[PDB]
Each structure stands twice: as structure tokens, then as C-alpha cells.
Write an enzyme that holds these catalytic residues in place. Structure first.
Site, PDB file in Angstrom:
ATOM      1  N   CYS A  47       0.843  -1.186   0.000  1.00  0.00           N
ATOM      2  CA  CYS A  47       0.000   0.000   0.000  1.00  0.00           C
ATOM      3  C   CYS A  47       0.883   1.242   0.000  1.00  0.00           C
ATOM      4  O   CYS A  47       1.558   1.530   0.995  1.00  0.00           O
ATOM      5  CB  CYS A  47      -0.902   0.025   1.218  1.00  0.00           C
ATOM      6  SG  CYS A  47      -1.751   1.657   1.261  1.00  0.00           S
TER       7      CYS A  47
HETATM    8 ZN   LIG Z   1      -3.498   1.547  -0.119  1.00  0.00          ZN
END
Ligand SMILES: [Zn+2]
Ligand SMILES: [Zn+2]
Ligand SMILES: [Zn+2]
Ligand SMILES: [Zn+2]
Length: 166
Positions: free
Chosen positions: A93
Site C-alpha cells: 500500500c
Molecule cells: Zn493503499
């Protein structure tokens, strides 16, 4: 068509990141099956001697959409590593890969990869994908360091035969 355009753009960048005079030693780039321009197998190296990651060869897969660069790629460590911004299944992420700084069509594979190695060294503990790692990073640095050292050692098993580490 959009797929055709994307594949030509990706090939241009692939050639830059693999041409002997343009390649970046931090990033070893191959295509899946040596031919799939939309799935790259990447070996991420941390050349900074200061880094607890130094000496590792962290294998990852970067999957590109058929409308690249109008949509972001996905990036997965394979295997997952212990890092505040890496999910347990290995997905990274990172803000540059969110649509819509988030992704923009002027981003390149090179700029993404640079951002990824930066995040390895300087995690975003305020938006953690792995809360255990985020807490250890700030509260248990020696525990964090020893876990990463283990993964560095494990990763050396993925150095391709013949490859010359920078
Ligand atoms: Zn993310
Ligand atoms: Zn190779
Ligand atoms: Zn060294
Ligand atoms: Zn813990």
C-alpha cells in the site's frame, strides 16, 4: 488497442530499466515468462549500507492494467515482508499507486520503483497496512530490526543463479 498502446509504452520503459547503460542497480527487472509485458518480476535491492534491508534481494511482482498509464499498477512482495505498509499477503500500500501524491498518467515505472525503495527505508506508520509492524517500528526497534534481518537472509535464497549483486 488501448492494450496495444499500453504495451508499447511499457516496452519503452522496460528497455530503459534493462538497457545496460540506463538500468538502475537497485532494481532487477524481468518479464513473467520472459515475455508478458504486463507482468514484471522485480528484484528490489537496498544499496544503502545504512539500511537494515541492505544485502537483501526482495522479489516482487508488478502487474500493469491494460489501460496503463491511465490506471496504476499493482505491486506485491513475493514473499511478503514485514513492513508497516505491506499487507500480510504481500500487497504494497503506497500512495502513488492509489487512484485517482496519488496516481497520475505522468508517473513512470521508474518513479514508482524509486518511491517503493524510499518507503522501505521510511515507512508511513500513520496509515499502516500492518499494524503489528507499525507498532514495532516505533516502539520495538530491536524486535523490528531482528525480524527484518531474518527476512534479508531468507531473501538471498532468491538471488538468481549467476546474478552479480551491485
Ligand atoms: Zn493503499
Ligand atoms: Zn534477471
Ligand atoms: Zn554491502
Ligand atoms: Zn509484536
Amino acid at each position: 488497442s488501448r492494450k496495444s498502446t499500453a504495451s508499447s509504452l511499457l516496452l519503452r520503459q522496460y528497455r530503459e530499466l534493462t538497457d545496460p547503460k540506463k538500468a538502475i542497480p537497485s532494481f532487477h527487472i524481468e518479464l513473467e515468462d520472459d515475455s508478458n509485458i504486463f507482468t514484471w518480476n522485480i528484484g528490489v535491492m537496498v544499496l544503502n549500507e545504512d539500511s537494515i534491508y541492505h544485502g537483501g534481494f526482495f522479489k516482487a511482482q508488478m502487474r500493469f492494467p491494460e489501460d496503463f498509464p491511465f490506471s496504476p499498477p499493482q505491486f506485491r512482495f513475493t514473499p511478503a515482508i514485514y513492513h508497516p505498509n505491506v499487507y500480510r499477503d504481500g500487497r504494497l500500500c503506497i500512495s502513488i499507486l492509489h487512484q485517482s501524491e496519488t496516481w497520475s498518467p505522468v508517473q513512470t515505472v521508474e518513479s514508482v520503483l524509486i518511491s517503493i525503495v524510499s518507503l522501505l527505508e521510511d515507512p508511513n506508520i500513520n496509515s499502516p497496512a500492518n499494524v503489528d509492524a507499525a507498532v514495532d517500528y516505533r516502539k520495538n526497534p530491536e524486535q523490528y530490526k531482528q525480524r527484518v534481518k531474518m527476512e534479508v537472509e531468507r531473501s538471498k535464497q532468491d538471488i538468481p543463479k549467476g546474478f552479480i549483486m551491485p
